[PDB]
């Protein structure tokens, strides 16, 4: 039903009845569509709990 096993059918991927935020090069059925998420840390804030 999904040849790339992503949660989108072959027919949805070739038809266009899909979440449009999918990249166009992922609209081919043999191309997987998946997020890659990683978190960066810009800044630290430490507070000394001293009364």
Partner 1 sequence: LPQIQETTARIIFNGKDLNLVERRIAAVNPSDPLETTKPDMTLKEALKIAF
Partner 2 sequence: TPITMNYNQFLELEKTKQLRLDTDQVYGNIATYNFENGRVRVDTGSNWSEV
Residues of each annotated binding site for Ca(2+): 10
Q: From the CB of 42, what's the least distance to partner 1, in Å?
A: 20
CA 37 from centre of chain = 7
Range 3-42, binding Ca ion (CB under 5 A): 10
- Look at residue 4 and give the partner it binds from Ca ion, partner 1, partner 2, none, a contact being a CB closer than 5 to 8 Å depending on partner kind: partner 1
Contact 3, 10 (CB under 8 A): yes
Residue 4 to residue 18: CA distance in whole angstroms: 15
Task: Give the residue, chosen from 12, 26, 29, 31, that forms a contact with partner 2 under the rule CB under 8 A.
Answer: 12
What does the block give as tokens for 16?
Answer: 């266009």
């Amino acid at each position: 039903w999904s040849t790339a096993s992503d949660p989108y059918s072959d027919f949805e991927k070739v038809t266009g009845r899909i979440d449009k935020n999918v990249s166009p090069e992922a609209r081919h059925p043999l191309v997987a569509a998946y997020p890659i998420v990683h978190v960066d840390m810009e800044n630290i804030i430490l507070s000394k709990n001293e009364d």
